[PDB]
Structure 1
Amino acid sequence: MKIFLDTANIDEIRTGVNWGIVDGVTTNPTLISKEAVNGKKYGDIIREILKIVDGPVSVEVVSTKYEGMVEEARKIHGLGDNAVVKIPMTEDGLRAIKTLSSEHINTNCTLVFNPIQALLAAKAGVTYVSPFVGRLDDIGEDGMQIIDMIRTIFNNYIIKTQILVASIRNPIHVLRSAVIGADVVTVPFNVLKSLMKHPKTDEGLAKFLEAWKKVSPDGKLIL
């Protein structure tokens, strides 16, 4: 399972990449607007993320019409080969995915909330599809059940579109995604950081330290 960071905060992205556990980044207009404050331009933020991340970087069109979408997608693709164009699940978005797929431009279909929307995006040729589990949780439906159905459907037809679980809110979204077999999760930085941690890991490290001081007062392994 690939793990992407879902943010536009450059500091978070730098830190996650240095742990070596971040395989890419997803952005959206809200995440970018959060960082385009106090002089910082959205164009510079996007270019910078593409620079520092070796994996895929998803960047969303802002046009809602077919022609604006494919025009902006070709501009986004032009910025770096790791750019992936995020496109919403709409009539015009499906048309844009089909065109861009034929042009060998990688695409990510976003704002997906049920399995048949995800299948429609796969049939248009999309590279990734992003179902939003946290926003389903918000409206009182267990969002992970949609991921489970998409995985089954994609397995049934040997679909090569990658399932990219998005709107992740907690580590159990991540655990359940891995058990189901989703291709990718994209996670906020706070969630990323929590995935490495466990209180028994902490306790065990402290007990090992104390036992080793019995045999080596300076606490080193001299071999």
Structure 2
Amino acid sequence: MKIFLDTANIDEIRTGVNWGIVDGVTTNPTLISKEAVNGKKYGDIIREILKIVDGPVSVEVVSTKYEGMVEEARKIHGLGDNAVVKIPMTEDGLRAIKTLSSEHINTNCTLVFNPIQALLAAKAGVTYVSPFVGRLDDIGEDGMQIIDMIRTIFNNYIIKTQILVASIRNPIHVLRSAVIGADVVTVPFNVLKSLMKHPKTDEGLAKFLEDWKKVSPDGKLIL
């Protein structure tokens, strides 16, 4: 399972990449808006992310119309080989995906909330689909069940579109995604950090340290 970071915050990205556990980044217009404040420009933010991340970086078009989507998508693609064009699940969006796929431009269909939307995006030839599990949770429906269904549907038809679980809120979204076999999860930084941690890991390390001090007061391993 690939793990992407879901943020436009450059510090978070630099940090996660250096932990070596981040395989790509997703952004969206909200995430970018949060960073493009106090004189910081969205164009600079987008270019910098592409620059410092080796894996896929998703950048969303803002046009709602077919022609605007493809125009902006080709611009995004032109920014770097690792750029992936996010396109929303709409009529114009599917048309754009079909065109962009025929142009060999990688795409990510976003704002997906049920399995049939995911299938339609896959049929249009999208590279990734991004269902928003947390926003389904928000409305009283267990979002992970939609990931399970998408995985089954894709398996049925040997679909190569990657399932990219998005709107992740907690480490159980991550665990269930892995158990289901989703291709990718994209997670906020605070979630990313939490995935490494466990109280028994902390406790176990402290105990090993204490016991070792008995055999080596300076705490070193001299071999």
Q: Look up the match of 1:209.
A: 209
Distance apart, 1:81 and its partner CA: 0.2
* SS at structure 2 position matched to 1:46: helix
Distance apart, 1:200 and its partner CA: 0.1
State the number of aligned residues.
223
RMSD of aligned residue pairs (Cα, Å): 0.2
Distance apart, 1:170 and its partner CA: 0.2
5+ long unaligned stretches in structure 1: none
Distance apart, 1:96 and its partner CA: 0.1
Q: Look up the match of 1:62.
A: 62
Q: State the Cα deviation string for residues 176-200 of structure 1 (Å, max 9, x = none).
A: 0000000000000000000000000
Distance apart, 1:61 and its partner CA: 0.1
CA distance in structure 2 between the partners assigned to 1:81 and 1:213 by the alignment: 51
CA distance in structure 1 between the partners assigned to 2:74 and 2:22 by the alignment: 26
Distance apart, 1:26 and its partner CA: 0.1
Distance apart, 1:153 and its partner CA: 0.1
4+ residue runs over 3 A deviation: none
Distance apart, 1:150 and its partner CA: 0.1
TM value normalised by structure 2 = 1.00
* SS at structure 1 position matched to 2:109: strand
Q: Look up the match of 1:180.
A: 180
Distance apart, 1:13 and its partner CA: 0.1
The yes-or-no answer on 1:23 pairing with 2:40 is no
Distance apart, 1:154 and its partner CA: 0.1
CA distance in structure 2 between the partners assigned to 1:54 and 1:103 by the alignment: 22
Q: State the Cα deviation string for residues 66-99 of structure 1 (Å, max 9, x = none).
A: 0000000000000000000000000000000000
* SS at structure 2 position matched to 1:48: helix
Q: Look up the match of 1:34.
A: 34
Distance apart, 1:131 and its partner CA: 0.4
The yes-or-no answer on 1:127 pairing with 2:127 is yes
Distance apart, 1:149 and its partner CA: 0.1
Q: State the Cα deviation string for residues 91-149 of structure 1 (Å, max 9, x = none).
A: 00000000000000000000000000000000000000000000000000000000000
* SS at structure 2 position matched to 1:163: strand
Q: Look up the match of 1:93.
A: 93
Distance apart, 1:202 and its partner CA: 0.1
TM value normalised by structure 1 = 1.00
CA distance in structure 2 between the partners assigned to 1:21 and 1:28 by the alignment: 21
CA distance in structure 2 between the partners assigned to 1:45 and 1:119 by the alignment: 32
CA distance in structure 2 between the partners assigned to 1:142 and 1:96 by the alignment: 30
CA distance in structure 2 between the partners assigned to 1:168 and 1:217 by the alignment: 45
CA distance in structure 2 between the partners assigned to 1:194 and 1:59 by the alignment: 25
5+ long unaligned stretches in structure 2: none
